[PDB]
Structure formats: C-alpha cells, structure tokens
Design a binder for these strands. Structure first.
Ligand SMILES: Nc1nc(=O)n([C@H]2CS[C@@H](COP(=O)(O)OP(=O)(O)OP(=O)(O)O)O2)cc1F
Ligand SMILES: *P(=O)(O)OC[C@@H]1CC[C@H](n2ccc(N)nc2=O)O1
Ligand SMILES: [Mg+2]
Ligand SMILES: [Mg+2]
Lengths: 983, 363, 358
DNA sequence: AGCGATACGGCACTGGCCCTCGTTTT
DNA sequence: AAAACGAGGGCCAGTGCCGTA
C-alpha cells in the first residue's frame, strides 16, 4: 500500500506521472528477466507529525536552510574578497600574544584579533611540538602577528594545556577563518577544544582547489613526472595540492620561495629565534598567497558548486570533535607495550635463527645449504700499515707458593695495560662494522657508533627478503627465490626445455639437497607444475604461475600455512605462529607514529560545563580533554574527507593490537554519542540512477528491484543474498559487488572470488560466467553487434552509426556512462561539477572508471552534505544540546547528551528520510520505497564503534575497563517526537 | 633430559647422580654449584631490579626463618605481614605499597618424612579493595612479562586464572618442562582476613589513606620459586631437526649468565709480559663483569676443546690475548651466540662488554 | 643510648619496646630489621663479596643447607663448605690451594624457657698446604683488618687479638670497641685436616690436592665474620644538638633524597620523577620525599634525612622550572649549595667513585 | 573503445651525491 | 717531503608490496 512500496507523506499531492507504456515495458522486462514472485511482506508504516516545511518543495527547503546556515560566512568571505590590502610591516614585533599592524605597520599589543574574517597559517616547532610557536593573520582592515609564550628560555613541561592561539571573541555572525589546510590551524585554536560551541567555522583553500580543479592520484603521479594520445591537455589547467603549485595555478604570479632549511621541522627552538624575522616573513608570504588563492577560488567554487548545500555541508564537515580522557594515555602505553613485546619475541626468534645459521661458514659448507648460498659469506680482516722496523720476525717474538709482598704489582700491571692501550689507537681510523662475520650478518646488524645500538643481530624482518628464505620450506619444495617476484602464489599441452652447463666463474648452485628435501617431504620442470609444487634447476622462469605480480613475502596466507602446504622448518608450529605475530602487529606497525603523536589538549575544571561536574563522575582525579580530527574538508574524489589517521583507523578486531583506537573516543559524563551508518548508499544510488532513467517508479529495473527489497534485520540484503550463494559473508560480497559495478574484470573477479571462497578454478569460473550475465551484452572489423539487425553486409557506408554504446539486460551502466559522456558539468543531483582535468572537454579522456565512480561517489558525498545540513537544521531549531559532528563517509556520529539521545536518533531518522526523499525528488517521483526510507541501525553509547557489542585485544576486557554498553535502534525510538516534552 | 652431564661437568649443579626431577622440584637436592648459585644470584638480582628498585612504594623486608614460640617457615608472606605497621609509618599511610623479600623457605615433604628447602622471592602488595583486581592483573602481566624475557622460547611460560575455595581470584605461572608444565610462581588476592586476625584489638592502626578516605588494605601476594625458575632457564637455554650440524651449548640470557667473558692466553708460550692479563682482569672485575681466568692450564689442547668448554658454561665472549696483541693492541674475541673470530681493542673491549650487558638489559 | 631510639623512628631496626636493649641486639633474638638496616646489610655483604672476589686466584661461591641432612639447624658455616670440597676440586683442576666463600643465616641457642637466635654471617673456608697455612692466615688477618678499616670512621675502634690452643695451632679474633665493651666481630682459625678427614674416611686419596708435583692433604683456614655485629659496629661508628649518622658513602643505604619547595604542583612532580628515574638508572639509591604530602619544615626534614644517613639532600623549587638550578645540601659538611639538575648525576657518581680507596 | 574506485601510511631496497681516509706521488 | 685518485659509508629521494578505512 501502495504501488509496491510507499509511506504516508506530505511532500506533494501529485504525483503520477503514470507512464503506462514505460511500466508495461518494465513489467515485461522483469517478467522475462524474470522476477515476479513477490514476497508480499509490508513493513510497518509510521505515522508521526513531520517538522514544519518551508515550501514549496523540499529542494527549496534544503536550499533555504543551507543558505541561512552559510549566509554570515558568505558575507565574511565577501568581506575578504573586496578587502583592500595594507602593506606588510617593516619589522615583526617580538612580543607574546597578538600584535596588530595598522597604519604604517605599527606594533599594537592585542590579546584577541577582533575581525569578522581573516586568513590564517600557524607555525609550530616540531623539535618539541606539538605546541604552536608562530602565527600570522591578515584581515580586511590590517595585519596581525601572534607569538607563543616561547620567548623566554625555560625548562617547560608540555602536557598540552590551553596554550594554543586564542582567536574567538567572548560574548559576556560571527567568525570565519580561511587557510591552506585550515584544519591544522583549527587544531591550534584555544576555544575550539571546549565541549560547547562553536560559532566559528573554517574554509579550506586546499579543499576548494580540489573541488574546482582537482585531479586523481594517478593523475598526480604523471603530473609531477612532467619534469594517451590527448592525455597531456589537462596538464596546464590543473595542479597538485601544494600551496606553491595551487598559487602558481590560480594566481599565476611569481613562484613563492619555500624555507630551504626547513627550520620548523629540521631545527630546534634555538635556531628559530636566530631567524625569527625571516620565518615570520615566510609565514606572511604563506598567508598572503593563501589570501590571493582564496580570492580567486571563492567565485569559481561558487560557480562550479552553485547549490548552498555543498557550502554549508563543507562548513560543518570541517568542525569535527573527538572527546577523550586519560584512558587515551593508558591506551597508548598498553598498546605500545604489547607491540614492543610481540616484536621482541619475533626479533628474538629470528635473530636466534640467524645466529645458529652463521656457524656453517667453516668450512665452505654453506654451498650445500639449499637456502643459504646466494649471499656474501665474506671474511674481511683489514687493515694495518707498517711503521715499526726492521728485519726481525714479530710473529713468534706449576710452582706452588703464597706471596703478597708485591702489593703494588697490580698498579704495575695496570700501568703497563694503559700504556699499552694508548699506543694502538692511531693504528686504525674509522671503526667499521664487524669484518669477522659474513656480509649477510653485517647487514643484519646495527652500526657500532649508533645511539640506538642493540646487541646481536637486529633489524630482523618480517617483512624482509633474507629471513623468509632463511628458514621457510617452499610449497612442497625446498628453495625460494626473488628476481622480479618472490615465490609464486596468490596475487592443448605446453612444454619448456632444459639445460645444464659450466663455464666459470659463478656462484655454485646445489640441486641435490633440493631433491632429497623433496624426498623427505613426501616421506610421510615437468611434471608436477600445475597443482603440485616443485623447483627446477636453474633457468629461471615462470613455467606455471597464476599471479602476475608476486608476493614478497607471504604474509596473508594463514589458511595456506595451517593446512600443510606450505610450512616452515625448523620447525613445528613456529611458522603459523610467526605469521600470527605479523598479523597482530600489522596495524600498529604502520600507524603507531600517527597514533602516539596524535596530540590532545586537556581542558581544566575551570573551562568545562559545570553540568558535567554535577554529574556523578569526575572521575577520581581524571583528566578530560579532546582533539580535533584535523580533516581536509574535500579531497578527491569526490570531495570526500581526507585525514591521515582517523579515516584509516582499524575496526574492532580481537587480533589486531591497536584495534581499540576507534573505541577510545569516549564521551564526557552526562554526554553520549548517537550515530548511524547508511545501509546502503551507493548501491541504492546506482539503483535509482537506473530506474529513474528507465521509467518513473523505483522498482522498474532488474538491479534496482533487489536493492530495496532486502532487510538486514533478521532478513537478507542484496549483499547478503550474493553472500549466500555461496558465497562469503559479508564484506567480501560487498567488495565483489562494488567492484563489479565499477568494472567487473574477468580475471580480477576471478582471482578475487577464488581468494575469498577458497576452491577450484573451474567451478569458480562457472560461477563468474553465471554472474557476468548482468553486464552482458554491450555494443570494417568490429564486435559482432551493432545498431543494425545483422553485421554482415557488402560495401555499406555507416560511419554515422558507430557513435552509440551501451550495455543491455540487467544493469544500468548506460546511465553511468551517460553522465560520463557529457562534455558539460555532469552533475546529478545535486549537482556540482568537478575538475577541469577530468572534464572530457579537451581531455581524451580515457578515465572512464574514475568518472563513473565520480558520479556515484558524488551522489554519496552530496548525500553526506544533505545529512549534515539536515541534522544541523533541527538541532538548533529544537532543544538538542551537543551539535558537534564526527563523520566517516558512510557513517556519521553526533556528540549529544544522555537526556537528549533518543530525540537525536529521531533527528537522524528524519534526516535520512528527507535525504532519501530528496534523491527521489531530484529524479522523480517524490514517492520512495519502504525498506530504504529509514535507518535500520542507530548506535547510542559512550564510545563510538561499529556494532553495539564490542570486544578487544589489548585491554582484553572492555567492560572490565570503565565502559558501558550499546543499544540497537530500531523501532522503539519512533515514539519520542522531536518536541521537547516526551516520555 | 641429557644436559645433566653438562651440569655436572661444569658445576651449575651437584655432581651427584641422584638428581631426579623429584629431588630437584622438591628442593631436596644436595645444593647448587658455583655457576648455578651465580646464575641464581643474577636471576634474583634481576628480580630485585625489576620489582623493588624501579617501582616506588616498595621496600625490602627482613622476616625471620622461625617463630619465637621443630618446624620452620613455609612461606615468607606472614613475616612480611608482621611488618605492616612500621612500613606504613615510613610511607605515611600511603597505599598501595608493597614489601619484597628473597628468602629460603622450608617445605615438609613425605617421600613415597624429609624436609626440602628452596629459595623463594615474595612480594606482598598492600592495595585498596577498590583496585585489588586491577593490581592483580597488573602484577600478573608484569611478572609473566619478566619471566617471558631472558628466554629463547617465551612460548613455554604460561599463566592460569583460578579461583579460591571461597571465591578469591588468583593466577598461577607455569613453565613448560620437557615432561609437562610446572608451577613456578603464584599470585593471589587475600581479602584482608589475615591482617584482621593479627590485629583484633585496634583496627585503626590498619587503616590506609586510599586518597580522600582511609580503608582496610586488601592483601595481594606474589611468590616466585627462583630455584624452579633457575632450572627453567637452564632447560630453556639448551637446544631441533634437519640442522645438519649440532653443537652442545646452552644459550642463557647475557644478563643472568653466570660468567660473562673468559680470558685466556694464546701463543703460547710467551714470557714474560703476560702480566697484562692481570691488568685486564682487575679492570674487568672493577666494572662488575664476571671473567673466567685461563692462566694455569693443563690444556695445551685443541681450541675446540676449551671453546666447547666455554659454550657449556654459557660464557658470552672468549677474549684471547696473544703476542701480536702485545705488539700492537688488538686481542681476539669469540662470541657464543655466533661462533666467529673478531679482532678488537682493549678498553674498547671493556666498553663493548659494558654496553653489551647494558643494552641486553634493554630491548 | 640515644642511638637505639633513632634506629626505631628511622626504621633501621624492627618495632620493639622491651627487646630493644643492647643485650637483645647482641643476641640473635629478634625483632629483626627495618628497610634501612636491610639495605645497609645488603651493601655491607656486597662489599664483603667484592673484597674477596678481587682476591687471586679464584674463590667459588657456594650455598649450604640449613637443616640436618640426616633429619638440626646449622651452627657454623663450615660443614656445608667442606661437603663441596671434593666437587670444587675438579673446577680448580686440583692445581693450587683455594677457598670457598658463602654468606648465610646461621643459628645459635639463646638463654623461663630458652629460645633460638639468628645471625647472618659471612664465612670463607681457605684450603691451603700445612707449610703455607700460617702465613696465609696472617695474610687473611691483615686483609680482613684492612677490610674493616676501610669503611671505618676510626681504625682504632677495630682491634685484632691473637690466640692458640691444642685443637687450633694458631688463631686470631677480630674485636670491635663500642666502647661499652669490646665485642667479637670475626674469627680466624687454622683448623687441621682432622675436620675434613672425619667426614671422608676413606679412602682419603681424594682429599689430597696437587701442590707442585706433590700430593698433600691441605690444612683448613676458617674465616667467619658477622655482618649484623658489623652493621651495629658501623652504626655506633657513624653516630655523631645535632644527631647525624655519618655512614660511609659506599655503605650507606640511601645516599640521596629529593623533595619539592614550591606548593604542590604537577610539574614539580614531573621533574622529580624525571630525576628519580635518572638517578635510579645509574644505580643510585634515592629516597622519594616529593610524594609528599605536605612538606612541613626544612630543619626537621634535614634532621630526618641526617638520621637516615643520607649523603646529599636535594630541593627542587620553582626556579628549577626556569633555570634548572637545584638546591643541594651535604651531610658531612651540611653546606647549602646550588647546582644545575643536569650535572647532579655525574656529581653523585664521581663522589661515590672518589670514596673508592685503600 | 578498457579498466575497481577514492584515499592514508608503512618498511625493504637502491643508485647517486658527498665527505673521510688511505693508497699512492715532489 | 707533496699532489691525486679510488674505496667505503651515510643522507638523499624514488620505487615496489603491503597495511587500513
Ligand atoms: N572496497 C570498497 N570499495 C568501495 O568503493 N566502497 C564504497 C562503496 S560504498 C561506500 C560505503 O560502503 P559500506 O558502508 O562499507 O557498506 P554499504 O554497502 O554502504 O552498507 P553496509 O550496511 O555497511 O553493508 O563505500 C566500500 C568498500 F568496502
Ligand atoms: P570501515 O568502517 O570499514 O568503512 C568506513 C567507510 C565506508 C566507506 C569508506 N571506505 C572503506 C573501505 C574502502 N575500501 N573504501 C571506502 O571508501 O570508509
Ligand atoms: Mg553502509
Ligand atoms: Mg561505507
């Protein structure tokens, strides 16, 4: 009730728009495809009083909202654009705090620069960071230069107090701060760390540059290479995200000079004061270039992204906030400890293996070793020079008692010793590495004159290329090797000859110990090359490999390590345990720098909501603080968030060490976070882009009917339906689907599905051939399918027809290509054109996949912006405290309070509903399906995570530490209206 | 189960043949050798460093072996509990705080009538009831970590969570011997019962300032058998397939290793400026590193003989002084972990040893 | 006197009210020791083992059982060292005369009913040929006397007495002046082979060791020192309106203590924790008085740190958080000095190393 | 026209510039 | 006695595989 899925709505009375012929074609298509076995399972309709609409449509609703939410900031930006610039001061003031430079650049001591808008670029001595040291900010009125307290030589103690720069004005509109990578500067603002607030928002010129004339990483790679027939036309219309480059692109003035010494990251605080004026000047150049770039970018951005939703969305997306406490420090210490322990064990075992294998140097018995014969095995003993002379060989030149009368013979032996000592020092010069030990052992050791010297062979690895060959047996064989690729593995007769000859002089290669090792292995070039495993003699070539890349080293083959082949020796279960150790510290190895250096400002009990103090938690001399995620507002593609740490933060896995990083963001007492994850966005997006193109309704496609049919709650989604084929649940099927939509390569889907399902290649290939029915079909000499009924003809002139191309049957890639064919904005819906470097006008463009992905992912990001502005609209209109936002592409979490969590979840549901209705309205009709209108899962708890129930590794016990629990949601939250008076 | 000959040949134990697993695990053994008591010495010192020194609020306690009121003490926990008040006075009633002591205990054993003594290192940790379990888990992880290092295979040492007959939580530590796991250290959380029984009169002298309030201290306790531990490291040090070539050597950690370096005389014979060996000797012992003197000798044999003799004694390095070194000043050196000849300078050798041990203590 | 009362309040001895007398201290009956006393004894035993490890050629450390092997507690520390003689003959390769040192807790009956007392003594059993036994006995006499003389504030306080009998041909006993009564501190006897020949008959062909192509059953030297009596000796030797114990720097339990001066601030605790770790990193015993919790006076604080025999007292004021300067204060001179916090470690280490002389 | 896509880092390995020292030169 | 050329090791940026969302 009715039309195969709709809810009670007041978003337009009319309406149909029937399309009888169109729906006849859709019905016939879905009959021959064919799907006509409806389950007839009506979802429980919801009757609630919707918030007041402003009219006429929801388009003008979101438009007016986004406009009134970004109006003061647009005003401030306009104040920056028409700003008449006063010249730089002749000298910079060396005083703490802010210094105003107005008429003729005089020095006027100021605590806080009171301006509507300004540019900003903060400096910070990395040598003892992460505390700000210098800052420069220009305004439409005059200049400002801020110095930190680092003007007096003391022995400071950095616990990250409220030392960051003060920028916000007190009450007892309003602010806008622009800058290149503005999030980094925001992180150094004094009043941005508070629980409440804030009025001040930020505008990033880097993100704006990315939105206007951005380029993909693949493009960046060959852009900087400038130092595929028409792939070099966009080279001068776009640039990399660097400040100098973006300035050379948008301003095109003289090349700004960068600091040649990199004193802020290479030097200490000492050499900074020696070059204070110069560094100040450089910072000024930076904020000035940033100013110009902004001035040139704002109108371009406003032109290319006309809808205000993107503007306000980008405004709220830049003011993220992560509250934390001492548990953060404890997490750091514990995780680092665990990591150091596991690494200690691993390196201990490996160096143990490396020590007992060094003994077979004497005498020349290493040549027999089928693993250790490639490396050095050197024996050095250098050096000395003659100075003593002459002509005499220096190479050969039981009595019981009780004497002690020679009391001072000890100091005689001592004197002789010291006198002998200080006469040999001038014989050598520079202490080289240990020559006695073989070369492979020298390389596997730290230098003697190294400040971080550890005894024995260090630098063991995991993932090196010497140690895996040092011990491991090789796939029912003996030797492993590397040249262009390591041991071949994972990611009508054929013959190949053989040969064996000697000529001298090369390294000796054994091949009998190999055969004998094979004999010992089966004690429990051809043949045995297909499925079994064996190594030849020399050659070296492929002669039976599946992967076209190689894998040094095998670090994700645990099921291929705990099933016999392959194994290690010596010996036992040391192999799979080593792989386990590698798997555990894999995350913390490539992230510990980002996590430990992740700064955090602790706010004192004087500058925090006293309503939290009233709440029965302090907690026991506990410190409460926070950290701003420091996120680039818009990075390719499309204008997604870009953050070094929190966007690549590992989930809750009982295997990984720092797997708790996500659940360490604990909300302050009295407060709680309420968030949600769209399930699913891009799939339903592609679905809509299909059905809206085919006809008017949402279920008039083969692909678009299955997306909005399944429920994740005690049911089966499309991803889950493909995961139960079987099939692998569930993320793998998601990768398979989303990988299929953006180019279902036959070998890619092959090795992928074969990697995830673990079976034989034939049946797998059958499954793929069954699943490749979706993309089929498609379009002198050519593919045997055209616009004509038959391809065979004689001298038939038809070059005017070979301009159409599109798939058939199930999928809807034709529309995704339709948006990828337009040489004009290509912006659905909304509705923002991107990159002068990917726009097919004056571009080959040969970047199709990136553009299909651009379409759907842009729909996803506009979905995100819509969610942001929608959530912001009813959070200020109603009494919902805590508006701070924390978004991760699909998911989005708001820092609310314990008494306004359910109404916030209700706000999330309303938001999702309105946004879905928006995507429905932008293509027609305004009507939308049932199992897609509202969220299915709403997380409401203290720390943020994936599922409501969370286990972990490092702290072992989650609730054992001071935590709580989560709550699934749901249908019980649909009883608390948006009005304050509930329950 | 064949390294016993190495323990007898090189005295880390008694030369008596009657040294069964039972006689060693019960503590009825005739005694340890000089290298064995030195190993145990360094092990106990390594305990004292990583338990008492670095961590504050932990003070040494001297408990008696007997009672004023014949059988001796079974555990040095009670004697430490008797020194609770006085040690509360020097800490100014600031708990959590602990008392550590390494003393020999006497255990009555019915051999299937005798009594076996064994050295134990115990730490009694007086901690508030609010944070008892937390300190239990803390000490569990840290003790287990302390034992899992110094080992060539840390996988052997394990832990076991167990409850009392009443419900008190506790943890045991095992080592995997060739015949199965064996208890080496035990940790328990006594619920202030014994302290309440010892002081029935005034319980006011038992209150400890938890912070903003004085509470009755929950008594945590960790007792570690250093004999079974010494034997555990002794087995762990000794080596196991397709190695193609085997050599007898026990790989003890350079920190707890009995003799650090071994000084000898090569080429041989050379008279009479060999008094430099004495210089290097006193110089070495002055820095607190163990050095074996190879002066008066009957061998006069293959170098492999005394090399294996030093490898059976887990000696880290073998420094060789010959006449060429008497000429220039570059003595020879043979590491145990990797048997390889290496030339080096004298004071450079001293500082290399000090740095070797110091860095071995680290990561 | 007024020394036994400052050993109770500063935790050198265990808590007692009746068994605190000198007669009960001289006896093995206890009320054992306090942390300061334990550390003092540990340092003393350490220096003992150091003053015999430098001795050529080689002396092997051993441990003897406490109870009777045949079913009881030990009186002397000789038998257990005689049991490991034949075994340690192999390690010395039967080459030269050699000894066995060991420090252990021996017992002795103290006299209602009679009880049992304990004492931690350090013994050395030096096996040496009969022709060169007396000379080596005089050698050990001199070396032990000098050993007690090094850490002594006064060499005249320690004395050496000679004696002999029918069982022991020649023996020497080391006394200590209190001066409430000279007491026994260490015994040096020259027992014959009778003690050793009694536990191995026979076939006594094992006992005789090589002495320059000569087989001879070695005479036994019995060194037996008391570390508790020595502890009390140095305690009375250090006691000097002032009440300060001036124990030897190499012997003193806690050699430095650092507090704060400025009001309770976290940064002060940070700096003091840093200095704490730095000082403990180079093996320097440091008393943490920065906990603290009040820091009342300074004179009674210095009095407390002088009654605990702390060499140097360190004060970390608020200026230290600017210049790094810190307030040192000696014990033997009580001179209020000031120096940078970075050069403190080197100063303490050099000062301790400067006390190494004989 | 043919295609996983958008990122974020990490460690292992390498050819090249630069400084130091010795073998070789008035 | 004095000028010159080659060998060795560190700092540098680039590249190939892998780590995560
Ligand atoms: N490899 C990979 N590539 C791509 O391109 N995506 C993107 C495709 S869409 C977007 C969100 O996906 P999701 O949130 O992880 O999943 P869901 O299907 O949106 O709904 P759920 O309920 O969570 O399953 O990420 C995601 C991938 F993982
Ligand atoms: P995480 O919780 O696994 O994922 C969070 C979001 C979903 C979309 C985005 N993402 C994840 C993985 C991949 N491969 N690509 C993405 O865009 O992160
Ligand atoms: Mg999703
Ligand atoms: Mg997602």
């Amino acid at each position: 009730m009715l039309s195969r899925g709709l809810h009670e709505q007041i978003f337009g009375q009319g309406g149909e728009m029937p399309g009888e012929a169109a729906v006849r074609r859709s019905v016939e298509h879905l009959q021959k495809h064919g799907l006509w076995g409806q389950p007839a399972v009506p979802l429980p309709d919801v009757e609630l009083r919707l918030p007041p609409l402003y009219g006429d449509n929801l388009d003008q609703h979101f438009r007016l909202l986004a406009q009134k939410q970004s109006l003061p900031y647009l005003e401030a930006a306009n104040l920056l654009l028409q700003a008449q610039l006063p010249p730089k001061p002749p000298a910079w003031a060396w005083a703490e705090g802010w210094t105003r430079y107005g008429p003729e650049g005089e020095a006027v001591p100021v605590a806080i620069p009171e301006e509507r808008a300004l540019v900003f670029d903060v400096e910070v001595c990395l040598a003892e960071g992460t505390c700000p040291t210098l800052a420069v900010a220009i305004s439409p009125s005059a200049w400002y230069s801020w110095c930190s307290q680092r003007l007096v030589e003391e022995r400071y103690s950095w616990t990250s107090q409220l030392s960051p720069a003060d920028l916000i004005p007190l009450e007892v509109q309003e602010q806008l701060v622009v800058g290149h990578n503005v999030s980094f500067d925001r992180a150094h603002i004094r009043e941005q760390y508070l629980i409440q607030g804030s009025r001040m928002r930020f505008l990033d010129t880097m993100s704006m540059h990315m939105a206007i004339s951005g380029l993909s990483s693949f493009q960046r790679s060959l852009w900087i290479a400038a130092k595929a027939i028409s792939s070099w036309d966009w080279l001068d219309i776009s640039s990399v995200n660097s400040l100098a480059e973006v300035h050379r692109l948008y301003v095109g003035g003289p090349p700004l000079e960068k600091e040649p010494r990199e004193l802020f990251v290479k030097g200490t605080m000492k050499d900074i004061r020696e070059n204070f004026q110069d560094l100040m000047q450089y910072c000024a150049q930076d904020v000035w270039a940033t100013h110009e770039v902004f001035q040139q970018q704002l109108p371009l951005f406003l032109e290319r992204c006309p809808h205000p939703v993107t503007l306000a969305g980008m405004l709220e997306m830049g003011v993220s906030y992560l509250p934390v406490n001492q548990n953060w420090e404890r997490y750091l210490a514990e995780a680092q400890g665990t990591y150091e322990e596991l690494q200690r064990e691993m390196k201990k075992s490996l160096m143990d293996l490396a020590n007992d294998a060094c003994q077979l140097l004497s005498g020349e018995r290493y040549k027999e070793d089928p693993w250790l014969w490639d490396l050095e095995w050197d024996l050095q003993e250098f050096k000395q020079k003659k100075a003593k002379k002459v002509k005499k060989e220096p190479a050969t030149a039981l009595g019981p008692c009780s004497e002690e009368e020679e009391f001072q013979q000890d100091v005689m032996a001592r004197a002789c010793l010291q006198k002998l000592k200080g006469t040999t020092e001038l014989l050598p010069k520079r202490p080289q590495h240990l020559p006695g030990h073989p070369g492979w052992y020298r390389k596997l050791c730290p230098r003697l004159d190294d400040p971080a010297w550890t005894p024995g062979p260090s630098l063991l690895s995991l993932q090196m290329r010497v140690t895996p060959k040092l011990m491991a047996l090789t796939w029912d064989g003996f030797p492993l090797h590397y040249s262009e690729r390591h041991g071949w593995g994972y990611l009508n007769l054929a013959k190949l000859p053989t040969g064996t000859t000697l000529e001298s002089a090369g390294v000796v290669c054994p091949y009998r110990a190999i055969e004998s090792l094979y004999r010992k292995h089966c004690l429990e070039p051809y043949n045995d090359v297909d499925i079994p495993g064996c190594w030849f003699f020399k050659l070296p070539h492929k002669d039976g490999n599946s992967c076209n890349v190689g894998s040094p080293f095998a670090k994700d083959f645990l099921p291929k390590m705990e099933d016999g082949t392959l194994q290690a020796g010596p010996g036992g279960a040391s192999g799979p345990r080593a792989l386990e150790i590698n798997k555990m510290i894999s995350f913390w190895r490539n992230a510990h720098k980002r996590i430990s250096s992740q700064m955090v400002v602790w706010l004192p009990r004087s500058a925090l909501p006293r309503a939290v103090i009233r709440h029965p938690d302090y907690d026991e001399e506990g410190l409460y603080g926070a950290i701003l995620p420091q996120v680039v507002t818009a990075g390719t593609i499309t204008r997604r968030a870009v953050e070094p740490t929190w966007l690549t933060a590992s989930n809750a896995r009982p295997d990984r060490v720092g797997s708790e990083l996500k659940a360490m963001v604990q909300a302050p007492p009295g407060y709680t976070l309420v968030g949600a994850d769209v399930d699913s966005q891009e799939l339903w997006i592609a679905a809509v882009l299909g059905d809206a193109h085919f006809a008017g309704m949402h279920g008039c496609t083969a692909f678009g009917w299955m997306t909005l049919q399944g429920r994740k709650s005690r049911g089966t989604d499309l991803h889950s339906k493909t995961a139960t084929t079987v099939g692998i649940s569930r993320e793998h099927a998601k990768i398979f689907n989303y990988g299929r939509i953006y180019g279902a390569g036959q070998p890619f889907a092959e090795r992928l599905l074969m990697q995830f399902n673990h079976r034989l290649t034939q049946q797998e290939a059958a499954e793929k051939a069954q699943q490749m029915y979706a993309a089929t079909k498609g379009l002198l000499r050519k593919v045997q399918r055209e616009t004509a009924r038959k391809s065979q003809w004689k001298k038939w002139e038809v070059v005017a027809e070979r301009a159409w191309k599109g798939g058939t049957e199930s999928e809807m890639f034709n529309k995704l290509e339709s948006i990828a064919t337009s040489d004009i904005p290509r912006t659905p819906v909304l509705g923002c054109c991107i990159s002068r470097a990917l726009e097919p006008s004056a571009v080959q463009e040969e970047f199709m996949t990136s553009r299909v992905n651009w379409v759907v992912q842009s729909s996803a990001v506009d979905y995100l912006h819509l969610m942001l502005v929608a959530m912001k609209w009813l959070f200020e209109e109603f009494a919902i405290d805590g508006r701070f936002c924390i978004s991760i592409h699909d998911e989005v979490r708001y820092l609310v309070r314990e008494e306004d969590r359910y109404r916030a979840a209700l706000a999330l549901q309303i938001t999702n509903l309105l946004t879905r209705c928006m995507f429905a309205y932008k293509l027609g009709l305004n009507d939308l399906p049932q199992s897609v209108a509202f969220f299915s899962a709403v997380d409401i708890d203290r720390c943020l995570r994936k599922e409501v129930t969370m286990d972990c590794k490092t702290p072992s016990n989650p609730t054992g530490m001071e935590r709580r629990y989560g709550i699934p949601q749901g249908e019980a939250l649909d009883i608390y209206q948006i009005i304050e008076l509930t329950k | 189960a064949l390294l016993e000959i190495c323990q007898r040949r090189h005295f880390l134990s008694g030369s008596k043949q009657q040294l069964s697993r039972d006689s060693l695990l019960s503590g009825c053994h005739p005694g340890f050798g000089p290298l064995g008591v030195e190993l145990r010495k360094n092990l106990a010192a390594e305990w004292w460093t990583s338990v008492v020194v670095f961590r504050e609020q932990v003070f040494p306690v001297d408990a008696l072996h007997h009672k004023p009121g014949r059988k001796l003490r079974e555990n040095l926990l009670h004697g430490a509990l008797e020194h609770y008040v006085n040690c509360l006075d020097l800490v100014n009633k600031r708990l959590p705080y602990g008392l550590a002591q390494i003393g020999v205990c006497f255990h009555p054993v019915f051999d299937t009538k005798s009594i076996g003594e064994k050295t134990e290192a115990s730490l009694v940790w007086f901690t508030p009831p609010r944070t008892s379990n937390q300190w239990l888990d803390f000490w569990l992880r840290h003790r287990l970590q302390w034992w899992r290092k110094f080992a060539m295979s840390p996988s052997n040492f394990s832990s076991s969570d167990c409850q009392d007959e009443e419900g008190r939580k506790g943890n045991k530590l095992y080592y995997n011997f060739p015949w199965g796991k064996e208890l080496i250290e035990t940790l328990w959380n006594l619920g202030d019962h014994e302290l309440l029984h010892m002081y029935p009169g005034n319980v006011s002298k038992l209150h400890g300032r938890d912070g903003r309030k004085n509470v009755v201290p929950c008594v945590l306790s960790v007792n570690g058998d250093l004999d079974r531990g010494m034997l555990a490291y002794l087995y762990d040090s000794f080596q196991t397939r397709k190695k193609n070539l085997h050599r007898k050597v026990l790989k003890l950690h350079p920190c707890l290793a009995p003799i650090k370096v071994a000084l000898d005389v090569g080429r041989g014979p050379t008279l009479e400026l060999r008094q430099v060996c004495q210089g290097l000797f006193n110089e070495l012992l002055e820095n607190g590193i163990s050095v074996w003197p190879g002066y008066l000798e009957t061998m006069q044999s293959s170098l492999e003989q005394l090399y294996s003799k030093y490898d059976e004694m887990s000696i880290l390095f073998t420094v060789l002084v010959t006449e060429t070194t008497l000429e220039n000043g570059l003595i020879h050196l043979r590491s145990r972990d990797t048997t390889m000849k290496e030339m080096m300078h004298i004071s450079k050798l001293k500082d290399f040893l000090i740095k070797y041990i110091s860095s071995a203590k680290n990561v």
